[PDB]
Design a binder for these strands. Structure first.
Lengths: 382, 176, 44, 140, 174, 226, 232
RNA sequence: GUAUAAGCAAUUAUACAGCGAAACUGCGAAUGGCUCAUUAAAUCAGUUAUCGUUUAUUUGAUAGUACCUUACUACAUGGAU
RNA sequence: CUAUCAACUUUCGACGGCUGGGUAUUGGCCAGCCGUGGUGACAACGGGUAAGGGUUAGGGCUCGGAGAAGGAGCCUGAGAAACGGCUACUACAUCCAAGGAAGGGCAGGCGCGCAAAUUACCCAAUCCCGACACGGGGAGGUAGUGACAA
């Protein structure tokens, strides 16, 4: 366990030490043949085999909070960790490196992921209910719970009909692809394929709510965020022309305000009715931001920011002041938080999946109680 | 020696200066003997290039260490791919301005040498040896690599290289 | 034709994909204020 | 699309063309010697090697992207009739653009490594004949 | 589930077949390696005959051949420019074979001014095609990948020169 | 919680019955490998500080280092871990182990005394225990007895006398057959190896020279035919 | 573990050795072109009785095959392997007969010292050196530069070097070691190329029977020059 | 290959020497054979090819690779179990 | 064998060619780009289920898919998708001090209350596997019953 910042401490309790680790073969050879003096006390892991030896893609904790599903790269697989028993429940291999999954049930008993070789794979604990090829490539994955329907964005322009751009949506009770929700992306070359060209033609992020009204918000590469309403099956809004490709989309706890962000590193907190921004922040460097979620220390509200320049900044919403900043020392591809408090699980490029602990945003979760006492022992050490 | 180089670099890092502070991870991997050739092209041509503000602070330490790695006989193979390509891969990536300090640590006693005076030949210098016949060979192989990697940019360093090569040449021509 | 490996949305009812999840309506708003909201965006 | 090339020949020098003979008593056509098309399933341009069986026959369908189908007829011996019967088969072969292609002609093919699910043969010699459509028959 | 057999597909005459046999270990095909840009992450796979092939998943540098002059140097890899097969590899920066990718130019520039001596990109045998000279003034050349990164563990290759260089510039303009 | 207390520097160990968990309250919420003072344990433990190195809870489950749960956890154990030995090679087995945290539900606490005090525990600190075996390789004998280049380890090896059967005969000595001892048999093996190398290289030389002269003779006879 | 009838018809077994037959171990000669040492010792020569007796002969250094001690019992010895037994002072040689079976030939040291081996292929090995591969899988480094494919070589067998060679010739007498006309000592009088696979030779015996055998199945033995003693 | 079994059995030059349980190390188990919904030139047979491939074991050959700024040096190599 | 099977394939790409991925390698085997195919009254396709070759007097003799309680995923090795192991889910089931912990075959008898061939002995021969002359082998051979016959 380390501590990175001065004023408000974060705690890298599990994580890769070096930006260029050696091959694990050479590491085990030097460990079993050489003499070494490691920090036996403070260095540990908290859940068993929380690594992938190549890279990682996404982490999600269930609404029951007992299961951590995580997908990673070599022999492209997904680990399911039971978090009460602090170990691997299992790990199941797949056909290619996963893009993005969601849990459907409150447990891990139903999963779906959009997967790099243009597939959607539906997973049970029994095995794998069979895959559906989406026609065109995909970027994200969202779930309409009230009318159970998976919706994925697509890059590129459609085959026939209009040339807007498409969001592929299939219901689970009905079973078929209903109709692609048509989102304009822009103009493309008439001379190309049917998968698009290299420069543009991409819808990126789809975001919905699951306790409020739930306006299906999409976001596409010419600086455009769109809004669709369920039970209308048609467009409501087109707004937010920016310079950067929209990579962030997340509602707040109330169900009104939106936190979007662009590929240059600029975030805008919008209201759903005011065209002028409630908040703007131009931070980091020119590497594109990835993921932003709202998180409430039990009284206040604050916001995440995670960007591939190894910058994850927790901003304030009520004042806009930079509350804290973490340097994960590697590329990180996904952030999630334990829904109780405190713990940010981050899927990275490195070997080990790394998780941060904020004592000043919340407490240790209900399955690893002693983390607060370990922070206490580090406070004794300093 | 790799162990003494590691302990010496640990003492240099015990000197806690902000010019060496962002480069410590890049420094220690050069002494880790499995990642030297990859760490060289991480250091140079990387996103974390040496910043010209504290380039004046890191370069003597870095060049003494790279000199030691170019000297060391243990991990290198035989032939050219053993250690000749290592010397070439250090000198090909070094700058021509750092190359002055590189040849400064290269030529120990022959740094301040004079072969020619107002008269013809300094027989007082030539009838004396400051270096072993074992040691001049690695010097000449290194300067061959320096010249073959520099080209024209030897022009600011003409005054000492020719004295070194001429001294070793005429000591050989006396020893035939 | 040029459409085969999923290029064309073949609308076929899938057999094992038929009765996965029950529809769970989790919406904290009372359906009379929500349709009034979508009218009063940036245009109105 | 990418720039087609003969895989190991250094064109961009500031100081040729590789064509091997198939052998087997054959002659390289002038289009295969100097003609500037590039095809890697060509036995004179690419690295495909002809060995094994050597077959002949008459083309059914020339109209295809460098792949012709041959109707091979033979006389099978039915012992119930104690008689000879006509049996036609269809082969597929990859076509170099070196030769001049005709329909109904008698073409020599040669066996190579599997180039597709069907394509196991390449054209080597074409005999230009006035052979007709599907009504025409000759064991060949 | 990923395999290499032909028992699932229809025949040459257009017929499907039952032909049910179990998947076997010589019809084995493993999952693809989308080799991307990052620090070195290679996993070693043992294969039939006990033979190792090196599945490289994240790569930084490879040596590239400026071979009309007679050099190849280890240079880093900036970002993939174009790929003849797919657009998603161009989008997500995947290093495959026959990928045109832009690389750094510093060791080639160093070897030019070290061997000939006439500086470049800032008598008669030192001669550079002016398009390639524009690549040197940019400090970022257009290389092409000739080694399989997935099945060798390295992304090496030769630089583009002349007709192929102009062809891929026109294809970038397309 | 009975304390299995070991002094590793002396090589001794003793199990100590401890009742009155008010005495054991300072062991609570301490991970394995942590330093706790034995001063609040007893008056005879004044000045002692010791590390805790493991334990077994009720129902006898082991305690592996690096598990943050206080209760009994269900790990998946690989080959070279503690608390599990493989029944066959390549086997990963799910085993239940107690987490690192010393709670109230323990049965034995493995402790190791790192620094003593002025008082001696009568059965623990007083008895010395030598090592079972002495060193076998010559350079470890050299580093042990600090020999110079001349002093010839073969008489500086440790020895042990045993009395065999046969109704009480003479004592008998046993000596551990030094591994890294340069014998003339070893040196002759090295010489035979390099002699095989030079014999092979000279045979390659002679066969190459005779092939050169025979090939020149054959092309001379061929041009004599032409 | 093959049966006695599934054993090939050219190393003979009678109604005596049980229903089973030993398989030859992997080695220089092939499987179906082979005589194992146990069949040579106890089923052909009958210097032994049982498997354990054959083991008690083999394990002590008493049987030498091609001039080297061969210890394991089912060692393959197919064609023309000189088999030296020193306690009996004999050297046997394996040839065929006119019907197509194995034949043993007793001989002393003067003809036991050399082996007539047919060249399988000539190539350039590592180090830029030509090397020569016979049918005994003997590779000879730096050969004579005319010894091409299908030429036979007098191997020294005390150093292993080349001593003489016999060229593939129309007019050189040869021995057939395969095919439907197996084991017929006659003279190569014609050779047809058939380029594209499987060329032939036309061969006649001493007494006028022409037949066509393949150039793989042929084996050159000498023009007249019976360099190994075919049994009189 | 590794023996200081606190294992047996000894003496005429004492690291070990003979026998040698335990254990570390290397090899082994692509089968011996069982059950039952079947396989309709796809298997299978003849007949080719690998210039399109992997091969422990066998047996045969086999490897010219030093110096190259540690010298005011190094020259009976380590740690684990 | 059949036209009471004349259209079939493109309904897991159907035929190419280009580019790569993966494989030990070729290959629509798989992924991107486009072209229009491929088979069939000379019998495709579908349907029925009743699943021989070589040795030549002769008979004889020789050779000849799916599962290890059920799906799903993984590990070793030259060779397995071993089912030998692991993990999760499902389904039985055992011990316990009620906290926990290990496990998934064939053969035999009854199959009415009335019935009928040994729970035999050894690797000794032939053969196989190993650090290896010795150690280990459910092929094989030896014996016992028998008024069904002969």
């Amino acid at each position: 366990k380390l501590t990175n910042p001065g004023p408000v401490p974060v705690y890298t309790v599990a994580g890769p030490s070096t930006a260029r680790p050696l091959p694990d073969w050479l590491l085990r050879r030097r460990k079993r043949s050489a003499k070494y003096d490691p920090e036996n006390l403070n260095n540990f892991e908290l859940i068993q085999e929380f690594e992938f030896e190549e890279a990682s893609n996404c982490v999600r904790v269930s609404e029951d909070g007992n299961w951590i599903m995580s997908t990673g790269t070599y022999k492209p697989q997904f680990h399911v960790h039971n978090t009460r028993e602090l170990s691997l429940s299992f790990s199941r291999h797949t056909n290619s490196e996963n893009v993005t999954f969601l849990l459907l049930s409150q447990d891990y008993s139903k999963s779906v992921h959009l997967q790099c070789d243009r597939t959607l794979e539906f997973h049970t604990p029994m095995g794998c209910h069979y895959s559906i090829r989406i026609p065109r490539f995909g970027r994200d994955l969202a779930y309409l719970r009230q009318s159970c329907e998976v919706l994925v964005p697509a890059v590129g322009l459609s085959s026939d009909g209009s040339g807007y751009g498409e969001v592929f949506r299939l219901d689970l009770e009905r079973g078929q692809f209903l109709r692609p929700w048509q989102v304009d992306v822009g103009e493309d070359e008439p001379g190309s394929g049917l998968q698009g060209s290299i420069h543009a033609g991409a819808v990126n992020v789809a975001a919905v709510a699951e306790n409020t009204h739930g306006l299906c918000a999409f976001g596409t590469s010419i600086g455009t965020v769109e809004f669709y309403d369920p039970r209308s099956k048609s467009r409501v809004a087109v707004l937010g022309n920016q310079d950067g490709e929209i990579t962030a989309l997340d509602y707040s706890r109330d169900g009104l305000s939106l936190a979007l962000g662009t590929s240059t590193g600029q975030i805008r907190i919008f209201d759903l009715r005011n065209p002028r921004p409630l908040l703007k922040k131009d931070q980091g460097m020119g590497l594109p931001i990835k993921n932003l979620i709202h998180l409430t220390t039990p009284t206040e509200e604050r916001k995440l920011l995670s960007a591939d320049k190894r910058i994850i900044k927790i901003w304030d919403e009520q004042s806009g002041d930079l509350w804290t900043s973490v340097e994960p020392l590697v590329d990180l591809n996904f952030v999630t938080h334990v829904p109780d408090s405190g713990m940010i699980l981050t899927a990275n490029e490195g070997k080990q999946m790394h998780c941060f602990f904020i004592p000043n945003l919340g407490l240790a979760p209900r399955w690893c109680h002693f983390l607060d006492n370990l922070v206490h022992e580090m406070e004794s050490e300093k | 020696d790799i162990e003494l180089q590691k302990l010496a670099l640990k003492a240099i890092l015990t000197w806690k200066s902000e010019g060496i502070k962002p480069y410590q991870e890049h420094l220690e991997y050069l002494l880790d003997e499995a990642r030297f050739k990859n760490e060289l092209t991480v250091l140079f041509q990387g996103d974390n290039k040496i910043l010209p503000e504290h380039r004046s602070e890191v370069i003597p330490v870095l060049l003494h260490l790279l000199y030691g790695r170019a000297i060391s006989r243990k991990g290198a193979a035989s032939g050219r791919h053993g250690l000749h390509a290592t010397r070439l891969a250090i000198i090909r990536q070094l700058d021509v301005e750092d190359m002055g300090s590189f040849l400064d640590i290269g030529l120990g006693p022959l740094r301040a040498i004079r072969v020619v005076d107002e008269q013809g030949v300094r027989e007082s210098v030539f009838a004396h040896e400051p270096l072993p016949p074992r040691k001049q060979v690695g010097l000449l192989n290194m300067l061959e690599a320096v010249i073959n990697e520099l080209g024209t940019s030897v022009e600011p360093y003409m005054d000492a290289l020719v004295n070194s090569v001429l001294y070793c040449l005429v000591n050989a021509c006396r020893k035939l | 034709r040029r459409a085969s490996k999923g290029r064309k949305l073949r609308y076929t009812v899938h057999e094992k994909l038929q009765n996965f999840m029950a529809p769970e309506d989790r919406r904290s708003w009372e359906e009379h204020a929500i349709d009034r909201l979508f009218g009063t965006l940036f245009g109105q | 699309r990418a720039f087609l090339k003969q895989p190991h020949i250094f064109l961009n020098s500031k100081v040729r063309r590789w064509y091997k003979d198939v052998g087997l008593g054959f002659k390289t056509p002038k289009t295969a010697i100097e003609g500037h098309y590039i095809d890697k399933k060509c036995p004179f341009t690419g690295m495909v090697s002809i060995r094994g069986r050597i077959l002949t026959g008459r083309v059914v369908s020339t109209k295809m992207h460098r792949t012709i189908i041959i109707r091979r007829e033979y006389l099978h011996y039915i012992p119930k009739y104690n008689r000879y019967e006509k049996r036609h088969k269809n082969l597929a072969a990859h076509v170099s653009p070196a030769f001049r292609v005709e329909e109904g002609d008698m073409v020599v093919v040669g066996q190579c490594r599997p180039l597709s699910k069907t394509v196991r043969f390449n054209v080597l010699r074409v005999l230009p004949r006035t052979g007709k459509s599907v009504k025409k028959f000759q064991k060949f | 589930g990923i395999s290499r057999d032909s028992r699932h597909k229809r025949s040459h005459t257009g017929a499907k077949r039952a032909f049910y046999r179990k998947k076997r270990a010589f019809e084995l095909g493993r999952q693809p390696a989308n080799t991307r840009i990052g620090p070195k992450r290679i996993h070693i796979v043992r294969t039939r005959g006990g033979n190792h092939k090196y599945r490289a998943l994240r790569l930084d540098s490879g040596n590239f051949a400026w071979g009309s002059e007679g050099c190849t140097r280890k240079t880093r890899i900036i970002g993939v420019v174009y790929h003849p097969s797919n657009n998603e590899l161009v989008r997500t920066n995947t290093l495959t074979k026959s990928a045109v990718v832009q690389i750094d130019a510093a060791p080639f520039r160093q070897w030019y001014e070290a061997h000939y001596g006439q500086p470049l990109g800032r008598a008669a045998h030192g001669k550079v095609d002016p398009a390639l000279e524009k690549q040197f003034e940019a400090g970022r050349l257009y290389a092409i990948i000739s080694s399989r990164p997935g099945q060798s563990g390295r992304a090496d290759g030769y630089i583009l020169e002349g007709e192929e260089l102009a062809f891929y510039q026109r294809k970038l303009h397309k | 919680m009975k304390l299995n207390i070991s002094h590793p520097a002396n090589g001794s160990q003793k199990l100590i019955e401890v009742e009155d968990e008010r005495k054991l309250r300072h062991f609570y919420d301490k991970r394995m490998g942590a330093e706790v003072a034995g001063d609040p344990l007893g008056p005879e433990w004044k000045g002692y500080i010791l590390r805790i190195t493991g334990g077994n809870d009720k129902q006898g489950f082991p305690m592996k280092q690096g598990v943050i749960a206080p209760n009994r956890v269900r790990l998946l154990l690989s080959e070279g871990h503690s608390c599990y030995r493989p029944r066959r090679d390549g086997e990963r087995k799910r085993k239940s182990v107690r987490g690192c945290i010393v709670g109230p539900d323990l049965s034995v606490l493995a402790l190791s005394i790192v620094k003593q005090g002025e008082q001696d525990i009568p059965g623990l600190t007083d008895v010395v225990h030598p090592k079972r075996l002495g060193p076998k390789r010559a350079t470890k004998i050299r580093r042990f007895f600090s020999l110079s280049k001349d002093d010839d380890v073969r008489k500086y090896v440790i020895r042990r006398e045993v009395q065999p059967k046969g109704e009480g005969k003479k004592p008998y000595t046993k000596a551990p057959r030094i591994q890294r001892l340069v014998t003339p048999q070893r040196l002759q093996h090295k010489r035979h190896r390099i002699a095989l190398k030079r014999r092979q290289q000279e045979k390659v030389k002679e066969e190459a020279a005779e092939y050169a002269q025979i090939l020149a003779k054959r092309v001379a006879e061929a041009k004599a035919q032409k | 573990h093959q049966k006695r009838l599934s054993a090939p018809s050219h190393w003979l077994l009678d109604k005596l050795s049980g229903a089973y037959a030993p398989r030859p171990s992997t080695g220089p000669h092939k499987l179906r072109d082979c005589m194992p040492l146990i069949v040579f010792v106890r089923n052909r020569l009958k210097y032994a009785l049982n498997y354990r007796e054959t083991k008690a002969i083999m394990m002590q250094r008493l049987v030498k095959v091609d001039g080297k001690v061969r210890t394991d019992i089912t060692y393959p010895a197919g064609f023309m392997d000189v088999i030296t037994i020193e306690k009996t002072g004999e050297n046997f040689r394996l040839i065929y007969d006119t019907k197509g079976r194995f034949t043993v030939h007793r001989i002393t040291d003067e003809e036991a010292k050399y082996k007539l081996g047919k060249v399988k292929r000539v190539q350039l090995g590592r180090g830029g050196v030509p090397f020569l591969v016979t049918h005994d899988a003997r590779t000879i480094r730096y050969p004579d530069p005319l010894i091409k494919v299908n030429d036979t070589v007098k191997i020294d067998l005390e150093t292993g070097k080349i001593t003489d060679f016999i060229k593939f010739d129309t007019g050189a007498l040869a021995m057939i070691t395969g095919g439907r006309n197996m084991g017929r000592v006659g003279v190569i009088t014609h050779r047809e190329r058939h380029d594209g696979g499987f060329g032939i030779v036309h061969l006649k015996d001493a007494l006028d029977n022409t037949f066509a055998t393949r150039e793989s199945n042929v084996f050159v033995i000498g023009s007249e020059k019976p360099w190994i003693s075919l049994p009189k």
